[PDB]
Amino acid sequence: PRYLKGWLEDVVQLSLRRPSVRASRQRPIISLNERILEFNKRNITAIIAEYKRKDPSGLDVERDPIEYAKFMERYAVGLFISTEEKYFNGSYETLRKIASSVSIPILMYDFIVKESQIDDAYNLGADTVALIVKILTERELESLLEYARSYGMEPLIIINDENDLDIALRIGARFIGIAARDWETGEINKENQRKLISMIPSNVVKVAKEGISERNEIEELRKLGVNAFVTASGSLMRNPEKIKELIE
Ligand SMILES: [Cl-]
Ligand SMILES: [Cl-]
Ligand SMILES: [Cl-]
Ligand SMILES: [Cl-]
Ligand SMILES: [Cl-]
Numbered sequence: 001p002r003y004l005k006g007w008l009e010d011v012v013q014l015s016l017r018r019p020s021v022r023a024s025r026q027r028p029i030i031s032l033n034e035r036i037l038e039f040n041k042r043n044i045t046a047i048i049a050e051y052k053r054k055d056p057s058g059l060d061v062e063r064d065p066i067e068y069a070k071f072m073e074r075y076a077v078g079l080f081i082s083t084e085e086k087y088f089n090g091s092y093e094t095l096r097k098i099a100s101s102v103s104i105p106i107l108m109y110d111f112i113v114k115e116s117q118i119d120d121a122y123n124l125g126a127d128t129v130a131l132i133v134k135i136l137t138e139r140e141l142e143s144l145l146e147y148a149r150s151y152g153m154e155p156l157i158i159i160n161d162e163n164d165l166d167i168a169l170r171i172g173a174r175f176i177g178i179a180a181r182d183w184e185t186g187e188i189n190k191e192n193q194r195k196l197i198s199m200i201p202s203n204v205v206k207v208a209k210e211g212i213s214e215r216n217e218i219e220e221l222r223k224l225g226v227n228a229f230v231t232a233s234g235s236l237m238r239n240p241e242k243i244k245e246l247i248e
Pocket of ligand 3: 180211
């Protein structure tokens, strides 16, 4: 992993030592990027619902994992399931339970730094994972992108700035997540987000990671070419029913 500081460095160290899990997949691969394209083709707003109990820059949230996932199965294009333990209060067991309970795509959201975590995601029932440019060397990215693809999963490469984007396109990523929030400060920069979105080739499936909170903001990024959206952190955990308004 790259040289880091703060909670990011600590979570990267925690990931490096994360034990592999014993489990075997009993679920098809329900591709997230392809389903996003399907929604686009039907002109249906594609919203990826996030299940997260905690955030190093947010407040805690308690809500039944299965209940939430089953509710979202009716509206969301897919789910983001946080599995990082210390700062996000995530769990491999939670991902497994959820994956066994719904038929829509699931992305295991964690800080992937080694192959065994991708094995874990596949074995637990996730359909894909996110790879974060900020914490990975180019070499690690190339290697993890290929490993994920060998399982038939197209990973979501998360970028925060121009250099991140250049590296993503350089290695051949086709599924890119543009983050509106800053990892360390927790600050939202919509302008930077829109700029990066405007620099991405049309054949790359683009996901706006936060940066939108209501239907009208979704409409605007949709015109900039954004394919799918992950809404402002905690908004759906607080008001699940709001997704209906978002995709109306
Ligand atoms: Cl920064
Ligand atoms: Cl802003
Ligand atoms: Cl936002
Ligand atoms: Cl917003
Ligand atoms: Cl209603």
